[PDB]
Amino acid sequence: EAKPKFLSKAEREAEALKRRQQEVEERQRMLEEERKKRKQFQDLGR
Amino acid sequence: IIKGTQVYSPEKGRWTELGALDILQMLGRAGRPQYDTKGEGILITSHGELQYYLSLLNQQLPIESQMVSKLPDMLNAEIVLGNVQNAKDAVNWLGYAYLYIRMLRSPTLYGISHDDLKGDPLLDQRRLDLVHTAALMLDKNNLVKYDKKTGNFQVTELGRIASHYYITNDTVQTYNQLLKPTLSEIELFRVFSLSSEFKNITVREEEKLELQKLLERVPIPVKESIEEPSAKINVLLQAFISQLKLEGFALMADMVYVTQSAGRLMRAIFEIVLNRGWAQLTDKTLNLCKMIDKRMWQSMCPLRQFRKLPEEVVKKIEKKNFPFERLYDLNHNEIGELIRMPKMGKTIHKYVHLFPKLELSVHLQPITRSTLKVELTITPDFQWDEKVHGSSEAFWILVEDVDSEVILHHEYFLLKAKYAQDEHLITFFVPVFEPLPPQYFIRVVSDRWLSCETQLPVSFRHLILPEKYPPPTELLDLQPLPVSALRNSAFESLYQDKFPFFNPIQTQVFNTVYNSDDNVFVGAPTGSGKTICAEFAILRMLLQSSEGRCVYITPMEALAEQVYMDWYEKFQDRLNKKVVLLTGETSTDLKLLGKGNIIISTPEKWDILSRRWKQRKNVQNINLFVVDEVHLIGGENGPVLEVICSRMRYISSQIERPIRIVALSSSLSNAKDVAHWLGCSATSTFNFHPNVRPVPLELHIQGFNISHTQTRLLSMAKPVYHAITKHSPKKPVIVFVPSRKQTRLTAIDILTTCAADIQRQRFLHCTEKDLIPYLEKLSDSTLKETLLNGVGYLHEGLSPMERRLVEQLFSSGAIQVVVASRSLCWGMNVAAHLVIIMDTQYYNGKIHAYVDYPIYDVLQMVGHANRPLQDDEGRCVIMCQGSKKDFFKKFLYEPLPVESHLDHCMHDHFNAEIVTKTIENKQDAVDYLTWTFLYRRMTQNPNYYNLQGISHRHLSDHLSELVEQTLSDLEQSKCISIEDEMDVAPLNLGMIAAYYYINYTTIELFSMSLNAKTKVRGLIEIISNAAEYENIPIRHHEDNLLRQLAQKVPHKLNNPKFNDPHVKTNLLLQAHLSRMQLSAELQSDTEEILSKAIRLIQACVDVLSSNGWLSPALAA
Amino acid sequence: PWESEFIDSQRVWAEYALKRQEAIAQNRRLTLEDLEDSWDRGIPRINT
Amino acid sequence: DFKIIYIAPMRSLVQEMVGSFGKRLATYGITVAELTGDHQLCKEEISATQIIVCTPEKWDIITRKGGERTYTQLVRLIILDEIHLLHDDRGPVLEALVARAIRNIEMTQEDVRLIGLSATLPNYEDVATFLRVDPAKGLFYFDNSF
Amino acid sequence: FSSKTEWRVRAISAANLHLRTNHIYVSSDDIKETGYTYILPKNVLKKFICISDLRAQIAGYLYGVSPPDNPQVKEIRCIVMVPQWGTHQTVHLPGQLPQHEYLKEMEPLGWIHTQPNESPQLSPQDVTTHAKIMADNPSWDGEKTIIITCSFTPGSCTLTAYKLTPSGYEWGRQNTDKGNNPKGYLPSHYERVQMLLSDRFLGFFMVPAQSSWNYNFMGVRHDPNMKYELQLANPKEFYHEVHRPSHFLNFALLQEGEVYSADREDLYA
Amino acid sequence: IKPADTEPPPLLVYKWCQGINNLQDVWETSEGECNVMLESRFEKMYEK
Helix, strand or coil, X not given: CCCCCCCCHHHHHHHHXXXXXXXXXXXXXXXXXXXXXXXXXXXXXX | CEECCEEEECCCCEEEECCHHHHHHHCCCXXXXXXXXXXXXXEECCCCCHHHHHHHCCCCCCCCCCCCCCHHHHHHHHHHCCCCCEHHHHHHHHCCCHHHHHHHHCCHHHCCCHHHHHCCCCCHHHHHHHHHHHHHHHHHCCCEEECCXXXXXXXXXXXXXXXXXXXXXXXXXXXXXXXXXXXXXXXXXXXXXXXXXXXXXCCCHHHHHHHHHHHCCCCCCCCCCCCCHHHHHHHHHHHHHCCCCCCCHHHHHHHHHHHHHHHHHHHHHHHHHHHXXXXXXXXXXXXXXXXXXXXXXXXXXXXXXXCCCCHHHHHHHHHCCCCHHHHCCCCHHHHHHHCCCCCCHHHHHHHHHCCCCEEEEEEEEECCCCEEXXXXXXXXXXXXXXXXXXXXXXXXXXXXXXXXXCEEEEEEEEEEHHHCCCCEEEXXXXXXXXXXXXXEEEEEEECCCCCCEEEEEEECCCCCCCCCCCCCCCCCCCCCCEHHHCCCHHHHCCCCXXXXXXXXXXXXXXXXXXXXXXXXXXECCCCCCCHHHXXXXXXXHHHHCCCCCEEEECCXXXXXXXXXXXXXXXXXXXXXXXXXXXXXXXXXXXXXXXXCCEEEECHHHHHHHHCCCCCCHHHHCCCEEEECCHHHHHCCCCHHHHHHHXXXXXXXXXXXXXXEEEEEECCECCHHHHHHHCCCCCCCEEECCHHHCCCCEEEEEEEECCCCHHHHHHHCHHHHHHHHHHHCCCCCEEEEECCCCHHHHHHHHHHHHHHHCCCCCCCECCCCCCCHHHHCCCCCHHHHHHHCCCEEEECCCCCHHHHHHHHHHHHCCCECEEEEEHHHCCCCCCCCCEEEEECCEEEECCCCEEEECCHHHHHHHHHCCCCCCCCCCEEEEEXXXXXXXXXXXXXXXXXXXXXXXXXXXXXXXXXXXXHCCCCCEHHHHHHHHCCCHHHHHHCCCHHHHCCCCCCHHHHHHHHHHHHHHHHHHHHHCCCEEEECCCEEEECHHHHHHHHCCCCHHHHHHHHHHCCXXXXXXXXXXXXXXXXXXXCCCCCCCCHHHHHHHCCCCCCCCCCCCCCCHHHHHHHHHHHHHCCCCCCHHHHHHHHHHHHHHHHHHHHHHHHHHHHCCHHHHHHX | CHHHHHHHHHHHHHXXXXXXXXXXXXXXXXXXXXXXXXXXXXXXXXXX | CCEEXXXXXXXXXXXXXHHHHHHHCCCCCXXXXXXXXXXXXXXXXXXXXXXXXXXXXXXXXXXXXXXXXXXXXXXXXXXXXXXXXXCCCCXXXXXXHHHHHHHHHHHCCCCCXXXXXXXXXXXXXXXXXXXXXXXXXXXXXXXXXX | CCCCCHHHHHHHHHCCHHHCCCCEEECCCCCCCCCCEEEEEHHHHHHHHHCCCCCCCCEEEEEEECCCCCCCEEEEEEEEECCEEECCCCEECCCCCCCCCCCCCCEEEEEEEEECCCCCCCCHHHHHHHHHHHHHCCCCCCCCCEEEXXXXXXXXXXXXXXXXXXXXXXXXXXXXXXXXXXXXXXXHHEEXXXXXXXXXXXXXXXXXXXXXXXXXXXXXXXXXXXXXXXECCCCCCCCCCCCCCHHHXXXXXXXXXXXXXXXXXXXXX | XXXXXXXXXHHHHHHHHHHHHCCXXXXXXXXXXXXXXXXXXXXXXXXX
């Protein structure tokens, strides 16, 4: 919110690990949906 | 026996006769002085050429001037050097030539009739005609801006390039017509080959066959046909660089001629193209300069520029074509087996690590939306060797856009041999345009070495530009405020005879400052009279109750002295309100704050009072806090100003009665942040524009493209006088110069230039009848020498006796020019019509670099061009290096972006708020940091502060990393103690460091570096190693007289490096203790040392007090 | 078609401009052998 | 505290005058060198040396680019070897050099001593007036019998 | 090729390729209105036209993103030049797709290549190249990846972006006939997609790091299974010095040269 | 003033259509914007 809270360095890097785990999970999700789009594009010509 | 007298001269392109010089020297070898009684010189000639050599060798060939051949080029060289300015000075220079004396003695031979010598005996009309004809050749070829009205010359940059590289005026007209940004390498050889140096190169048929054998082998294609001469010059340059063996004598001679011209011609093309900013063509032209010089193509191995290698191993490297940067990562075994030359491998490794290779790192910081500050650190990653590199390696730093077709910033970079193996900080400012580019590129290329280029992409992916700042508040055309709009009669009785109406800034600002009670930000340019807005706030505070208390903070101590002299005459003499000025003693400042109604201060003198504001009631119940020049929050000694204004807002948030802050400043761009940080409204924030000033400033900026700085500083000396004559002939001038020693030299160079002209003593508007009571007071005799001719000067080494008397001679108008040092920009009770700012850089000898002026210094210097009633305008001519030219064309016309530098200067104030128990845990450390300007600027310009966003997560975690880094630095210093990893408490060292205002790392050094057996011999080494002395100045020529001081003083120094500030303060402390004679510039720094010495020694007393050691404490 | 005529006229007089400046570079005149692909083309025809 | 410029017309004459003045002024510790190289090498060679032996064109391109401006108050003697190069097509370089030095003597008022060595050719009194040589004290004309 | 002076007149011709960059045409026909839209910025298009050859085809992999709150339009933000050599009718790109940390924020939008002259159809070599790149790289979505062809018309450039239909990816994947008219090649194998230009934003380039991009003279040094890193740089011209090293490096050294040269003193240097 | 010597009347029509189309947001009507094409003849020009 408005007042910035202090976050400890262990807590900051835990938040950063949770963040980078989130976006590597959405990168994995987008990659397997990319595989789904690719299979869909592939079998509409086969 | 001189056989033939016929040499093939390629500059005439034909077989011409032997010169007078070569024949006279060949025939000086006739007869040896040991053995021979008689020389015998046979000279076999054509018969028509017999009389020439008979006249030559028998005292009968007259020496006649050939200057009409090259008169526009020599006239351009005198125009470029500034030796001639108008056609009269060019006629004066032509009178010194041999052509003038030969035209006087033999008029008939030089196209003058005796009718014209009888009608012009000194021959001034013929010199005017020659100067006018040569100047028509110069302005036709765009070398000189020459008006036939006044006869004045202006130098063009093509003029500078043609003079610097000797290329003729027709050649620069060719390079002005033909050089486009879009030229390929094919067209570049063609533009070179159309030089007028090769206007006599014709292609003869007897070599055309050989030229075809070159044209099928040269690697850059030629658009011309080979029987056109430009194709011949093209393929001869390319056959030179390719090292093709030629066979015709005429063709080898033409090749040698076109390449010895091609060095200067390609350097002149490179300078034209670099100055216009074309990045692809400046890469091509600088590469072609280095290819003509090194005689190799750039695809060849860079190890051919080391001429000590065998060419067989170099062709083995070029045969095995990997990139040259592959050779860096290999071992000397791995190189030698990659080339299959294991014998040569160690030598190839030595020469690949002798090859110049800079490692660049960029730290970019968005200043405005338009400008970034790139701090490029250059790291030499090559072993220096004097036999291959020499005294220096020259580089070009080219910063260019994504397309690499516009150079946004080029600058020369000398890597000197003393300063290899260490990082060079090159700070510059690049513009950023509205289609925000993905990158800029920094190419640092060698000026001499082929394939020595480091490119660095300054990527703008995660670049958060600051918001386009709100427009400045307009001068609403108020009808000008009579002083009767103030209320009390005693209040007008100190403004009656000064001015009847206030300036429009004060009219607009008056009703909010006087007739309201809000926090007011007044952002107006230096010279708008914002101190009268401070005085409006003070008169309001003295209306509310007469025992009120203003506190007036000026960031410079000389500004505090000047406003104390103003307000002691204004508020104590006429309103009987006590105006006190605080000095650096905490014992008497509490008394002065308790007794005074207007408390003048510096930020560090108010910091030591406000640090204990819970204890001091007189810090709490102040009724008004005026902060003059808060735009100095973005400089050195600027975090302390930010901390005391943040504290004075935080106190006002706690003490039942608000402390009304009135922040005066120069005109800011980000003034909404200073308003939001100091609680000003949107209606009470008067952020004006730099064009709003009561006397309009005419600011001219002169670029001097001279990278060497004594050369630039001496090349500025005649344009200083020419700026005086152009901009203010009969009106006061201040010339601000980089140093204490430059002001005497420039005060003499103005006088030698005004005595070069017939207007000697033109700067003395009074008589020498009137100067003897003021000249007999001075100590500096050369100041009397310069003052009697009308040019005073000012620096730190003068006494305030001499300083105040030169300022009184200048304020009265008796003298016209005052050459003041750069550090006297704040402390001058005088303002001129013209302010010349000569060379806005100064030598920081701690880093051995010419650091630029901070823009607050230049803005105060500019604001010295402000005479309100006497002058209709105020002119300022900033002579600066052309690398710094657009940095001043930004930051002086558009308002000032100020950014807090508190995150680097944090630990002192965090320690001080910890010993106050303001910061009791790390959460309150972030909560205290939210009161600063740093918090307000981290959300508007995040990437200045290594942020990645303005969100609450980014801001909160960056503030938490800031506080947990500074409190780790304070607990590792044992200044504070952190329990539960959250709650901080003051320890002993922190209490000592925040009591007597010492840097935390100084007492980190003290309690680690004082043992139980230290003594005064070592204690001066301890106190001289304090970090309060790292800002002592090391200038040039400061090293060897300190070495002269290292042999005398009663204690020797183990490993003294005279680049150190600390051993300088050690020597100066010892020389003050031995009461030795000093140079004036060194006792100028000794008084800087001894001001902070006594609190350091008391800190030593207290750290040895807590440590329980009797004898070192008594030694302290 | 007129749309084809105008885009070919634009691009063919562009080609004539570059061919003309490169033939002024070679000091000669534009012959019939260059501008033979541009022949019945251009709204002022290249014929003209 | 001083620099001496020796302006000799040809470059191999300069490279052997460097050896001659380096042998003769060796007992004084005087550094004799030849102005060559790029402009940074030339300003470093000017800052390091006392006898600066150069061509008229190299000294003129240094004075045009400005790499001697810090050491022209230290130049107290220019010696123009073979000043009958005034007749050559390289003549304007020497006339520009001497008009610039004589003009700086008349403006800046620090006197430089100009020593023109010449061959015995006519208009020597005009080279004397050109060099600001007083024809009583400074002008010495030895014909080919000498 | 003729390889002795064909590259000289070609080099000269390619020196004037900046005149093609203000006369740019976009083929706005046959565009199916239901696909993506592609904004190629004019700065990388200008740079891509200048570094090209009028005869030999160069090619660059397009990378881009979509603008915020407009997923139906694709701003090309990058052209990656890779080590390629090209004939007049195809480009031999390496097997390795461009991998770099700056291309992780962007998605591969296909490739751009130059053509010597305008054809109203996509080349069969282009649809086989695109479908082999698609069949070997699953990050190439056939809906979003295109082939921009910058055909060199007289004094200008005509740009046409094409997409592969699912018929075209299957045919070009199975295809081995590298001729100009292979069997089973129909104009239903591609559909012209909307592509448009921009002054409003700027793209960038990625060149190889160790070497440069043009292997048309270094043709034996180019393998289809070669590996390359990338580099945030601007690409050199086609006939740049570093691209034809046999024209600058095969010179016999100066052995007993300059011995009967001319005596001329460099008076100024 | 037309007919210009460099453009035929169908090139006048093409240049005019492309000049209408290349005005700034010329087909945007959301804020109530309205283009108006007037064509007229200056009636009895030659007679009066």
